Amino acid sequence: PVWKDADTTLFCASDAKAHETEVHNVWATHACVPTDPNPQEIHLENVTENFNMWKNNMVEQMQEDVISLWDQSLQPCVKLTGGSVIKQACPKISFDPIPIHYCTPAGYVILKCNDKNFNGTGPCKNVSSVQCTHGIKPVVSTQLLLNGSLAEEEIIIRSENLTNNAKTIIVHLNKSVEINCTRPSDIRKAYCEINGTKWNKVLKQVTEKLKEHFNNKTIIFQPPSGGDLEITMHSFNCRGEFFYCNTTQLFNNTCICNGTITLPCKIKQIINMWQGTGQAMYAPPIDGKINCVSNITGILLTRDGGANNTSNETFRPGGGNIKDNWRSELYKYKVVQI
Amino acid sequence: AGLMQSGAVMKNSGASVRVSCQADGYDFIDYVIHWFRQRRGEGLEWLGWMNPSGGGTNYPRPFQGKVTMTRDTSTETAYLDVRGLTYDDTAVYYCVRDRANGSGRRRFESVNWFLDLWGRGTQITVVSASTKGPSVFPLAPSSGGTAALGCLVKDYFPEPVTVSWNSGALTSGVHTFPAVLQSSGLYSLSSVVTVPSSSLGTQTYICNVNHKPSNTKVDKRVEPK
Amino acid sequence: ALTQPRSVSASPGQSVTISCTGTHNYVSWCQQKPGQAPKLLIYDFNKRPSGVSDRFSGSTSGNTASLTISGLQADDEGHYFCWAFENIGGGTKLTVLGQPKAAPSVTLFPPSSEELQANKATLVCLISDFYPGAVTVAWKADSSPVKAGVETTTPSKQSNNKYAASSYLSLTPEQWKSHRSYSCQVTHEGSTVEKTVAPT
Numbered sequence: 001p002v003w004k005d006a007d008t009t010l011f012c013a014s015d016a017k018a019h020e021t022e023v024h025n026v027w028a029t030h031a032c033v034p035t036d037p038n039p040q041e042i043h044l045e046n047v048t049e050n051f052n053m054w055k056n057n058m059v060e061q062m063q064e065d066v067i068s069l070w071d072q073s074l075q076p077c078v079k080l081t082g083g084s085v086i087k088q089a090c091p092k093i094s095f096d097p098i099p100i101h102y103c104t105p106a107g108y109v110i111l112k113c114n115d116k117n118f119n120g121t122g123p124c125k126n127v128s129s130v131q132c133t134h135g136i137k138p139v140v141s142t143q144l145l146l147n148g149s150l151a152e153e154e155i156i157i158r159s160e161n162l163t164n165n166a167k168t169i170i171v172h173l174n175k176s177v178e179i180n181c182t183r184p185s186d187i188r189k190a191y192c193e194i195n196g197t198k199w200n201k202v203l204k205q206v207t208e209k210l211k212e213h214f215n216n217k218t219i220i221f222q223p224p225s226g227g228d229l230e231i232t233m234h235s236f237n238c239r240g241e242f243f244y245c246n247t248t249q250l251f252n253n254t255c256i257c258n259g260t261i262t263l264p265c266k267i268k269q270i271i272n273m274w275q276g277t278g279q280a281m282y283a284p285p286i287d288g289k290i291n292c293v294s295n296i297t298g299i300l301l302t303r304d305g306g307a308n309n310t311s312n313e314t315f316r317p318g319g320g321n322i323k324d325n326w327r328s329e330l331y332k333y334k335v336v337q338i
Numbered sequence: 339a340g341l342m343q344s345g346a347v348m349k350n351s352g353a354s355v356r357v358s359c360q361a362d363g364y365d366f367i368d369y370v371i372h373w374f375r376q377r378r379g380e381g382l383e384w385l386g387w388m389n390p391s392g393g394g395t396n397y398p399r400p401f402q403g404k405v406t407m408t409r410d411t412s413t414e415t416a417y418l419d420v421r422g423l424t425y426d427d428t429a430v431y432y433c434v435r436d437r438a439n440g441s442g443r444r445r446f447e448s449v450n451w452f453l454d455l456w457g458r459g460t461q462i463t464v465v466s467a468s469t470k471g472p473s474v475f476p477l478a479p480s481s482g483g484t485a486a487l488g489c490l491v492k493d494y495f496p497e498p499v500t501v502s503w504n505s506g507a508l509t510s511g512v513h514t515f516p517a518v519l520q521s522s523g524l525y526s527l528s529s530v531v532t533v534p535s536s537s538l539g540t541q542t543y544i545c546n547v548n549h550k551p552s553n554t555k556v557d558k559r560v561e562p563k
Numbered sequence: 564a565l566t567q568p569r570s571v572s573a574s575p576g577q578s579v580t581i582s583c584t585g586t587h588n589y590v591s592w593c594q595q596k597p598g599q600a601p602k603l604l605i606y607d608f609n610k611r612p613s614g615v616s617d618r619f620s621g622s623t624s625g626n627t628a629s630l631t632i633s634g635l636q637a638d639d640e641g642h643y644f645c646w647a648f649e650n651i652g653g654g655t656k657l658t659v660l661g662q663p664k665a666a667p668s669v670t671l672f673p674p675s676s677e678e679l680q681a682n683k684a685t686l687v688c689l690i691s692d693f694y695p696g697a698v699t700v701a702w703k704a705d706s707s708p709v710k711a712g713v714e715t716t717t718p719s720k721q722s723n724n725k726y727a728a729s730s731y732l733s734l735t736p737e738q739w740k741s742h743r744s745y746s747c748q749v750t751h752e753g754s755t756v757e758k759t760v761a762p763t
């Protein structure tokens with residue numbers, strides 16, 4: 001065995017049905033390969049290897065794939081960009097993401113870190129060799145991470161550096177909490193339901209760990225300070241509808257109120273294109289009950305700078321870089337060539 | 339690669355102002371932008387940063403509510419807003435691109451903020467407007483270790499005042515300082531003459547101050563005691 | 564939040580060192596010339612980007628980082644500053660000596676009779692005839708430092724290529740007649756002079 005870190009074009013694999021109209025299947029039948037039946041892992045005994053989740057090329061290829069899945073699937077009636085405007089036909093689609101696996105070609109292999117407190121950047125004691133990652137759902141969402149993998153043992157805090165306030169911090173939860181979003185049978189308005197008891201228990205635990213990493217300082221949360229609608233609220237796609245939820249009450253400092261927390265959301269039809277660019281118009285929503293249950297597995301936060309001369313650290317929710325989503329799922333993988 | 343900032347602006351107490359930074363030569367949408375402030379005589383202060391991709395921001399507690407940063411990605415332009423202008427806010431404001439932070443591929447590999455590309459700065463001057471001609475006062479000479487005497491020109495607006503000595507015939511060792519803008523939004527300036535001590539009681543010195551904005555001409559003789 | 568010395572000077576062909584004291588955190592350096600926009604020189608204590616001269620170098624030793632400039636040229640005349648994230652130093656004027664150093668005359672003028680007849684008290688301190696053009700002006704009431712009411716002007720070239728500066732301390736007569744002593748303290752290339760004045 002002789003290897004070195006390398007960057008290569010991976011290929012995706014999935015268990016898409018070839019006879020499906022749901023668009024993640026349509027896209028994976030042509031873009032990916034069938035997933036391997038009986039797959040092999042081999043533990044590399046007494047091997048220690050340094051991973052680094054914040055510099056990892058898998059994350060970038062997975063972004064390009066997801067970008068290109070959305071551009072093929074989402075059908076906005078109008079697209080308006082730098083002077084342009086294209087009107088098209090915009091039927092509604094069957095939307096629900098499916099697990100994707102990422103796989104090395106010949107001559108390369110994917111190292112996977114099995115050390116279960118692994119924050120994402122250190123050296124790793126219990127390394128494995130695999131041909132594919134596990135099944136990652138390409139769900140895009142801001143503020144909260146949905147339908148992801150859980151932390152194995154203790155809640156984990158990831159960041160390229162906590163002392164640099166310009167770097168996103170990613171909290172990976174112990175134990176998931178359901179978020180139930182529903183537009184029922186004026187018609188843009190919906191809401192999400194969260195069990196306040198479970199959630200606050202978890203949020204208390206998340207502050208105790210943030211306290212660990214900030215020299216037992218006083219931790220408080222605050223609404224996002226600025227930016228576009230997609231980052232200042234928990235945004236996401238359910239069944240092709242673009243939901244935007246005010247999550248202010250999710251971070252209620254006062255009570256670290258324990259019935260059900262209900263967040264006000266709206267289904268929007270004008271959305272910014274997350275290919276930077278411009279905006280896209282979508283058709284008004286379905287009739288009947290649009291309903292999505294999702295595990296909350298992670299949160300993306302930003303620490304407020306200044307405040308060295310103080311006794312408190314303040315955090316605000318916010319995504320914006322969809323790539324950190326991917327990082328929260330690929331932090332244990334690294335591609336090498338033999 | 340370059341940042342082109344907007345020209346200098348003048349405002350009164352209260353009010354708001356907006357100053358822009360126009361990127362060119364590079365992909366504005368990657369890379370974070372910080373703003374920075376320098377008051378006259380002080381060092382730079384950090385005002386916050388703004389990720390032009392999603393518009394996310396981060397301001398130190400002393401400036402949240404007083405500063406806001408925004409952008410327009412279609413023209414690749416950053417914007418800084420200073421609300422509730424006080425005389426403290428008179429300063430030089432700088433926008434800068436940090437190649438170490440941002441979305442997309444070309445982060446530069448520096449753990450510190452890589453404050454790479456700087457604009458030239460925009461001057462925000464807070465002058466409580468109105469007018470007000472100045473009052474002129476003698477800096478009288480008193481206590482080899484020769485003589486210096488002069489003129490204090492206090493509380494006027496706007497610039498400028500002209501100062502001269504003996505209606506322009508004295509030019510030897512005279513030096514009129516720049517005006518300084520005080521807490522009151524009014525300017526003040528001083529002018530001096532080094533003279534040989536053997537000339538007090540025999541050579542005579544007059545301040546000639548002229549402020550045309552308010553029709554004011556004063557002649558103030560400086561006597562020692 | 565990072566100290567830094569206010570001025571530093573040396574002559575062509577020599578070398579100088581700017582320091583800032585205050586962090587153990589990665590520090591980078593910038594050089595702002597007159598008329599131009601700042602440019603990065605050193606990052607992360609001692610690294611150089613491509614396109615920066617080998618005369619610039621960086622070093623750190625327990626809570627103080629240093630920028631060192633070898634083989635000084637007069638194009639290096641400028642302002643130099645450091646940061647460790649949002650922790651910034653006050654900046655240092657670097658002068659490449661183009662003429663012999665000259666200490667300042669300072670004279671401190673008390674409130675004129677005529678301004679006190681108008682209920683105002685302006686102390687004015689005029690510093691003149693110095694090179695390099697960088698000084699510190701500190702007001703003292705009796706023995707104590709003064710923070711409020713101080714407006715100082717930046718050194719501007721005199722009529723003979725030396726520098727002058729002016730400083731003003733604005734008081735009401737109450738606070739004026741409440742100290743018995745007031746002084747202007749001017750520091751220049753190490754040496755301080757203090758002129759004192761009294762309600763008399």
Ligand SMILES: *[C@@H]1O[C@H](CO)[C@@H](O)[C@H](O)[C@H]1NC(C)=O
Pocket residue numbers: 114115126
């Ligand atoms: C190494 O990783 C495997 C994953 O299959 C895990 O089951 C095992 O407990 C790990 N070993 C140690 C010592 O943690």
Ligand SMILES: *[C@@H]1O[C@H](CO)[C@@H](O)[C@H](O)[C@H]1NC(C)=O
Pocket residue numbers: 119120121122123157158159160161162
């Ligand atoms: C992650 O762990 C490594 C050691 O394994 C440590 O050097 C690094 O500071 C840690 N980072 C965070 C964000 O905890």
Ligand SMILES: *[C@@H]1O[C@H](CO)[C@@H](O)[C@H](O)[C@H]1NC(C)=O
Pocket residue numbers: 147148176295
């Ligand atoms: C939600 O969380 C439960 C753990 O209680 C897990 O078994 C289930 O797979 C999760 N659903 C997802 C990830 O869609």
Ligand SMILES: *[C@@H]1O[C@H](CO)[C@@H](O)[C@H](O)[C@H]1NC(C)=O
Pocket residue numbers: 153154155174175205209
């Ligand atoms: C959650 O993590 C905390 C500390 O991070 C720990 O005390 C607790 O046992 C964990 N809970 C679960 C369900 O693993």
Ligand SMILES: *[C@@H]1O[C@H](CO)[C@@H](O)[C@H](O)[C@H]1NC(C)=O
Pocket residue numbers: 178180181182193293
């Ligand atoms: C989600 O909410 C709907 C309507 O409020 C409810 O009927 C449904 O049972 C909920 N689902 C879960 C898993 O709680």
Ligand SMILES: *[C@@H]1O[C@H](CO)[C@@H](O)[C@H](O)[C@H]1NC(C)=O
Pocket residue numbers: 195196197198258259260
């Ligand atoms: C919320 O979770 C708690 C567990 O802490 C449990 O009683 C139940 O699942 C929920 N309670 C209510 C009142 O909804």
Ligand SMILES: *[C@@H]1O[C@H](CO)[C@@H](O)[C@H](O)[C@H]1NC(C)=O
Pocket residue numbers: 216217218311
């Ligand atoms: C934890 O931090 C607080 C500071 O907010 C301090 O007052 C308290 O004593 C600390 N607790 C312990 C057990 O040290």
Ligand SMILES: *[C@@H]1O[C@H](CO)[C@@H](O)[C@H](O)[C@H]1NC(C)=O
Pocket residue numbers: 223232233246247248
């Ligand atoms: C969410 O609601 C709270 C209080 O009503 C506050 O954070 C903010 O006004 C709302 N956020 C929006 C409208 O984006």
Ligand SMILES: *[C@@H]1O[C@H](CO)[C@@H](O)[C@H](O)[C@H]1NC(C)=O
Pocket residue numbers: 248249252254255257258
């Ligand atoms: C926090 O919880 C309780 C609600 O029962 C109350 O103190 C307050 O209204 C809440 N804060 C919010 C909703 O921002």
Ligand SMILES: *[C@@H]1O[C@H](CO)[C@@H](O)[C@H](O)[C@H]1NC(C)=O
Pocket residue numbers: 096097139146147236237238239292293294295
């Ligand atoms: C999360 O998984 C559930 C279960 O399949 C699905 O119904 C829901 O749409 C998913 N949420 C998102 C945002 O993809």
Ligand SMILES: *[C@@H]1O[C@H](CO)[C@@H](O)[C@H](O)[C@H]1NC(C)=O
Pocket residue numbers: 160161162163164449450587588589647648
């Ligand atoms: C930021 O984190 C790195 C670890 O990757 C550490 O070396 C560095 O000291 C931290 N920041 C500063 C300013 O030192």
